[PDB]
Amino acid sequence: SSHTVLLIQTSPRLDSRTWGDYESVTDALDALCKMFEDFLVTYDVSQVYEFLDKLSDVSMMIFNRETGQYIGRTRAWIKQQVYEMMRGRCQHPGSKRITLNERFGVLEKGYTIQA
Amino acid sequence: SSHTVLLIQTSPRLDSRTWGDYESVTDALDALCKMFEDFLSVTYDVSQVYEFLDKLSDVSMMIFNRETGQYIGRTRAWIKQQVYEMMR
């Protein structure tokens, strides 16, 4: 499981920027699927891609244990992961927290925090 | 220059989590003092910026590293050290 930071901007207003973090990539992707359902029963593939395209911004920082650093991933990659997670539920045509500050500080000392 | 993400949480509410990104660490630190100056609206000493950063529920930077093509997480303590050097 790779600690993941999710960067989102819902509207073109800069103050709609928010972030969350997750113990795994799968959890961060799941959170996006839940955001998509909240913005709506049944949905087709195009709705998921266009929900993700309509976000003014969406990207992830994914922890890489071998370097102790974070790989950046942007919308094109996220859309393919989210589609794969959502593919079985889409219609188609035819038919108590850790702060980032503390976590980065433990990391600077040579340690990872592991769920 | 290193692309920089500034991540903040201003209150204990998870909905106070916000971010900005910048083409340089300089731009990100500049952006952070401007946040503090607006709360201040006067001069201030380093202690005052330090206290401002302490009262944030979370503050960090993620800074692009060209050797790895990956981002390094920087702590609030790291940020205060750079603020200090911006003021010596």
Author numbering:
A (entry chain A): 4 to 43, 51 to 105, 123 to 142
B (entry chain B): 4 to 44, 51 to 97
Quote the study's own text.
To understand the molecular mechanism how TOST-1 binds to ERH-2, we made a similar fusion protein by linking ERH-2(1–103) with a fragment of TOST-1(34–54) via a (GSS)6 linker, crystallized the fusion protein, and determined its structure at a 2.20 Å resolution. In the TOST-1-bound structure, the ERH-2 homodimer is similar to that in the PICS-1-bound one. However, only one TOST-1 molecule (aa 35–54) is visible in the structure since the crystal packing prevents the access of the second TOST-1 to the symmetrical site. The TOST-1 fragment (TOST-134–54) adopts a helix structure with two extended ends, and the helix is accommodated into the oval-shape pocket of the ERH-2 dimer. The helix of TOST-1 (aa 39-48) interacts with both ERH-2 protomers, ERH-2A and ERH-2B, via hydrophobic and electrostatic interactions. Leu39, Phe43, and Leu46 of TOST-1 make extensive hydrophobic interactions with Val8A, Trp22A, Phe73A, Tyr80A, Leu10B, and Met71B. The main chain amides of Leu39 and Asn40 form are hydrogen bonded to the carboxyl groups of Asp67B; The side chain carboxyl group of TOST-1 Asn40 is hydrogen bonded to the main chain amide group of Arg85B; The guanidino group of Arg42 forms cation-π and salt bridge with the side chains of His6A and Glu26A, respectively. In addition to the helix-mediated interactions, the Arg36 of TOST-1 forms salt bridge with Asp24A, and the Thr51 of TOST-1 also makes additional hydrophobic contacts with Phe73A. By using ITC binding assay, we found that D67A of ERH-2, R42C and L39A/F43A of TOST-1, abolished the interaction between TOST-1 and ERH-2, whereas the ERH-2 D67A binds to EBM in a comparable affinity with the wild type (Kds: 4.3 μM vs. 8.5 μM). In addition, those mutants abolishing the ERH-2/TOST-1 interaction, including D67A of ERH-2, L39A/F43A and R42C of TOST-1, all demonstrated delay and nondisjunction in chromosome segregation and cell division.
By using functional proteomics, we and another group independently identified a piRNA biogenesis and chromosome segregation (PICS) complex (also named as PETISCO) that plays important roles in 21U-RNA biogenesis, chromosome segregation and cell division. The PICS complex is composed of TOFU-6, PICS-1 (also names as PID-3), ERH-2 and two mutually exclusive factors, PID-1 and TOST-1. The PID-1 containing complex is functional in piRNA maturation and processes piRNA precursors at 5′ termini via its association with IFE-3, while the TOST-1 containing form is essential for chromosome segregation and cell division in embryos. Complemented by biochemical and mutagenesis experiments, our structural biology data support that PICS is an octamer composed of two copies of each subunit, and unveil the assembly interface within PICS complex.
